[PDB]
Design an enzyme around this catalytic site. Structure first.
Site, PDB file in Angstrom:
ATOM      1  N   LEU A 117      21.755 -10.402  35.939  1.00  0.00           N
ATOM      2  CA  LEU A 117      21.223 -10.957  37.201  1.00  0.00           C
ATOM      3  C   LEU A 117      19.658 -11.454  37.104  1.00  0.00           C
ATOM      4  CD1 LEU A 117      22.357  -8.714  39.966  1.00  0.00           C
ATOM      5  CD2 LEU A 117      23.334 -11.096  39.635  1.00  0.00           C
ATOM      6  N   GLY A 118      19.129 -10.478  35.864  1.00  0.00           N
ATOM      7  CA  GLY A 118      17.573 -10.973  35.374  1.00  0.00           C
ATOM      8  C   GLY A 118      16.999  -9.876  34.881  1.00  0.00           C
ATOM      9  N   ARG A 119      15.642  -9.810  34.836  1.00  0.00           N
ATOM     10  CA  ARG A 119      15.048  -8.641  33.874  1.00  0.00           C
ATOM     11  C   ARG A 119      13.643  -8.377  34.465  1.00  0.00           C
ATOM     12  NH1 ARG A 119      15.005 -14.079  30.814  1.00  0.00           N
ATOM     13  NH2 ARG A 119      15.271 -13.329  28.525  1.00  0.00           N
ATOM     14  N   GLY A 120      13.079  -7.195  34.207  1.00  0.00           N
ATOM     15  CA  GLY A 120      11.817  -6.940  34.707  1.00  0.00           C
ATOM     16  C   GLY A 120      10.883  -6.147  33.725  1.00  0.00           C
TER      17      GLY A 120
ATOM     18  N   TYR B  48      10.352  -3.016  32.695  1.00  0.00           N
ATOM     19  CA  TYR B  48      10.852  -2.066  32.333  1.00  0.00           C
ATOM     20  C   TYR B  48      12.412  -1.908  32.281  1.00  0.00           C
ATOM     21  CZ  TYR B  48       6.282  -0.437  33.038  1.00  0.00           C
ATOM     22  OH  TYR B  48       4.833  -0.485  33.325  1.00  0.00           O
ATOM     23  N   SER B  49      13.191  -3.105  32.637  1.00  0.00           N
ATOM     24  CA  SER B  49      14.604  -3.292  32.787  1.00  0.00           C
ATOM     25  C   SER B  49      15.359  -4.427  32.531  1.00  0.00           C
ATOM     26  CB  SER B  49      15.025  -2.565  34.157  1.00  0.00           C
ATOM     27  OG  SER B  49      14.669  -3.396  35.324  1.00  0.00           O
ATOM     28  N   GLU B  50      16.749  -4.742  32.514  1.00  0.00           N
ATOM     29  CA  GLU B  50      17.782  -5.667  32.409  1.00  0.00           C
ATOM     30  C   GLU B  50      18.616  -5.289  33.470  1.00  0.00           C
ATOM     31  OE1 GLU B  50      15.838  -7.338  29.825  1.00  0.00           O
ATOM     32  OE2 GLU B  50      18.093  -8.024  29.023  1.00  0.00           O
ATOM     33  N   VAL B  51      18.803  -6.174  34.624  1.00  0.00           N
ATOM     34  CA  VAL B  51      19.897  -5.799  35.648  1.00  0.00           C
ATOM     35  C   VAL B  51      20.957  -6.769  35.726  1.00  0.00           C
ATOM     36  CG1 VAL B  51      17.435  -5.787  36.831  1.00  0.00           C
ATOM     37  CG2 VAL B  51      19.254  -6.829  38.172  1.00  0.00           C
TER      38      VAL B  51
ATOM     39  N   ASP C  13       4.284  -1.905  45.181  1.00  0.00           N
ATOM     40  CA  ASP C  13       4.725  -3.079  44.374  1.00  0.00           C
ATOM     41  C   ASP C  13       5.325  -3.977  45.507  1.00  0.00           C
ATOM     42  OD1 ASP C  13       4.799  -4.801  42.268  1.00  0.00           O
ATOM     43  OD2 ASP C  13       6.889  -4.153  41.550  1.00  0.00           O
TER      44      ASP C  13
HETATM   45  C1  LIG Z   1      16.903  -2.754  40.353  1.00  0.00           C
HETATM   46  C2  LIG Z   1      15.578  -3.284  40.758  1.00  0.00           C
HETATM   47  O1  LIG Z   1      15.060  -3.212  41.762  1.00  0.00           O
HETATM   48  N1  LIG Z   1      15.181  -4.331  39.883  1.00  0.00           N
HETATM   49  C3  LIG Z   1      15.414  -5.716  39.642  1.00  0.00           C
HETATM   50  C4  LIG Z   1      16.362  -6.308  40.714  1.00  0.00           C
HETATM   51  C5  LIG Z   1      16.591  -7.719  40.341  1.00  0.00           C
HETATM   52  N2  LIG Z   1      17.706  -8.321  41.122  1.00  0.00           N
HETATM   53  C6  LIG Z   1      18.607  -8.067  42.129  1.00  0.00           C
HETATM   54  C7  LIG Z   1      19.410  -8.764  42.799  1.00  0.00           C
HETATM   55  C8  LIG Z   1      20.575  -8.524  43.741  1.00  0.00           C
HETATM   56  N3  LIG Z   1      21.307  -9.219  44.378  1.00  0.00           N
HETATM   57  C9  LIG Z   1      21.719 -10.460  43.649  1.00  0.00           C
HETATM   58  C10 LIG Z   1      22.173 -11.588  44.741  1.00  0.00           C
HETATM   59  C11 LIG Z   1      20.858 -11.822  44.049  1.00  0.00           C
HETATM   60  N4  LIG Z   1      20.142  -7.125  44.278  1.00  0.00           N
HETATM   61  N5  LIG Z   1      20.905  -6.565  45.328  1.00  0.00           N
HETATM   62  C12 LIG Z   1      20.333  -5.604  45.314  1.00  0.00           C
HETATM   63  C13 LIG Z   1      19.290  -5.253  44.650  1.00  0.00           C
HETATM   64  C14 LIG Z   1      19.145  -6.276  43.732  1.00  0.00           C
HETATM   65  N6  LIG Z   1      18.452  -6.614  42.776  1.00  0.00           N
HETATM   66  C15 LIG Z   1      15.985  -8.391  39.423  1.00  0.00           C
HETATM   67  C16 LIG Z   1      14.983  -7.641  38.692  1.00  0.00           C
HETATM   68  C17 LIG Z   1      14.632  -6.373  38.652  1.00  0.00           C
HETATM   69  C18 LIG Z   1      13.711  -5.714  37.718  1.00  0.00           C
END
Ligand SMILES: CC(=O)Nc1cc(Nc2cc(NC3CC3)n3nccc3n2)ccc1C
Length: 331
Positions: A44-47, A49-52, A155
Site C-alpha cells: 500500500l505504501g511506506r513511512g 519507520y515502516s512498509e504497509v 501527527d
Molecule cells: C499503519 C499506519 O498508520 N501506517 C501507514 C498507513 C498507510 N496506509 C493505509 C491505507 C489504508 N487503506 C487503503 C485503501 C487505502 N488503511 N486503512 C486503514 C489504515 C490504512 N493505512 C500508509 C503509510 C503508513 C505509514
C-alpha cells in the site's frame, strides 16, 4: 533565564489519576498473535519507520492493513501499542487488531482494521461545505477522546485521516508519534510534518500539550476551505515560522515569545522580519468561496493562535456555530 512553564488547560491530570501501567509504556509487555494467520496481498505504501501492506486474515477471511516496522526503539513500539490499546473502541480511532513478529524482518508488524480510503488528492476536490464540517466534527470526536484519555496524537495531517466517503466513515490513524501528556514534561519538538508543525515546535518550546493537535487541525481546515495545499508552505522549519508570521503577523508572535520567555534561535532574527496580521479574505477566490463562510473563518481564527493556551480545545471546537447543522443532523 529559562522559559515560563505551561500546563494543559484541560485534561491536565488524567494520567496522574490513572494506575502507572496505563502510561508507563517502558514496562509494557507486548501480547503476540500468530503471524501465520495473515497472508500479504499487496503493498500500500511506506513511512519513516515502516512498509504497509494489505493482507488477508486466513482464519476469518477479513481484509486487514499490516504495518511492518523498520528498526525502531523497543520503548517507541511499546508506546504506539499501549496508546492503541488504551484508545481501542474510541470514536473514529483506528482499531489495532493484532501484533505479530515478521519472519523475514524479525521486526513487529502491527495489524489494523482496513479502511476503504478515497485518496485525499482526489476526495478533497469533491467535498462540499457540509462534508468539510461533517468530517471536521468526526476528527474532533477522535481528538477530544484521545485528549480525554491523556494522549496527544502529534501527527495530525490529511494522510493520517482515512475516509471511506461512500460509508461516511473516518479513522484517525498512525499513532506512531503519539505521547501521554504529563504536566511539566518537556517533549521532543522534532515531531509532525513540516506544514502541520505548531509555532511551539518551531520556536523550540518543549512544555507543550494536546493544543498542538489543534494547530495541526487548523492547518487542515485552512487547506480544505481555501483549496490551498499546504496552507503554510515553508521551505524548511525556520521558513515554516516565516510563512505563519506572514499570515498571523509578527506582533502576536513576539508577544507569544515574550509571554513564555522563549529564547529565539539567532537565525530567526534576520528572516522573521515585520509582518501585519492578514485578513482571511485574501485567500478567498471564485473557486473556494462556496466552502468559506463567516462561521468557517471565526472557527479557523480560534484554532490558529501562536499561544497554545488560547487555542480552542477539541470540546470547545465541537460547540462552535460552524457545526450547528452537523450536530442537529446527528440528533
Ligand atoms: C499503519 C499506519 O498508520 N501506517 C501507514 C498507513 C498507510 N496506509 C493505509 C491505507 C489504508 N487503506 C487503503 C485503501 C487505502 N488503511 N486503512 C486503514 C489504515 C490504512 N493505512 C500508509 C503509510 C503508513 C505509514
Amino acid at each position: 533565564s529559562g522559559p515560563v512553564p505551561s500546563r494543559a488547560r484541560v485534561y491536565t491530570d488524567v494520567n496522574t489519576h490513572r494506575p502507572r501501567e496505563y502510561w508507563d509504556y517502558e514496562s509494557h509487555v507486548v501480547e503476540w498473535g500468530n503471524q501465520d494467520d495473515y497472508q500479504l496481498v499487496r503493498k500500500l505504501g511506506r513511512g519513516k519507520y515502516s512498509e504497509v501492506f494489505e493482507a488477508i486474515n486466513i482464519t476469518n477471511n477479513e481484509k486487514v492493513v499490516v504495518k511492518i516496522l523498520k528498526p525502531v526503539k523497543k520503548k517507541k513500539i511499546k508506546r504506539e501499542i499501549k496508546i492503541l490499546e488504551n484508545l481501542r473502541g474510541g470514536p473514529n480511532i483506528i482499531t489495532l487488531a493484532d501484533i505479530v513478529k515478521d519472519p523475514v524482518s524479525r521486526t513487529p508488524a502491527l495489524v489494523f482494521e482496513h479502511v476503504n480510503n478515497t485518496d485525499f488528492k482526489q476526495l478533497y476536490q469533491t467535498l462540499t461545505d457540509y462534508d468539510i464540517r461533517f468530517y471536521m466534527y468526526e476528527i474532533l470526536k477522535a481528538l477530544d477522546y484521545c485528549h480525554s484519555m491523556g494522549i496527544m496524537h502529534r501527527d495530525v495531517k490529511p494522510h493520517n485521516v482515512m475516509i471511506d466517503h461512500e460509508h461516511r466513515k473516518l479513522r484517525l490513524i498512525d499513532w506512531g508519534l503519539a505521547e501521554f501528556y504529563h504536566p511539566g514534561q518537556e517533549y521532543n519538538v522534532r515531531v509532525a510534518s513540516r506544514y502541520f508543525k505548531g509555532p511551539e515546535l518551531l520556536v523550540d518550546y518543549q512544555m507543550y500539550d494536546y493544543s498542538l493537535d489543534m494547530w495541526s487541525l487548523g492547518c487542515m481546515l485552512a487547506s480544505m476551505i481555501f483549496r490551498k495545499e499546504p496552507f503554510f508552505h515553508g521551505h524548511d522549519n525556520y521558513d515554516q515560522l516565516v510563512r505563519i508570521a506572514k499570515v498571523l503577523g509578527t506582533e502576536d508572535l513576539y508577544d507569544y515569545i515574550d509571554k513564555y520567555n522563549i529564547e529565539l534561535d539567532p537565525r530567526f532574527n534576520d528572516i522573521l522580519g515585520r509582518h501585519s496580521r492578514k485578513r482571511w479574505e485574501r485567500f478567498v477566490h471564485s473557486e473556494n468561496q462556496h466552502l468559506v463562510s463567516p462561521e468557517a473563518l471565526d472557527f479557523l481564527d480560534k484554532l490558529l493562535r501562536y499561544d497554545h493556551q488560547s487555542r480552542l480545545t477539541a470540546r470547545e471546537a465541537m460547540e462552535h456555530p460552524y457545526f450547528y447543522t452537523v450536530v442537529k443532523d446527528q440528533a
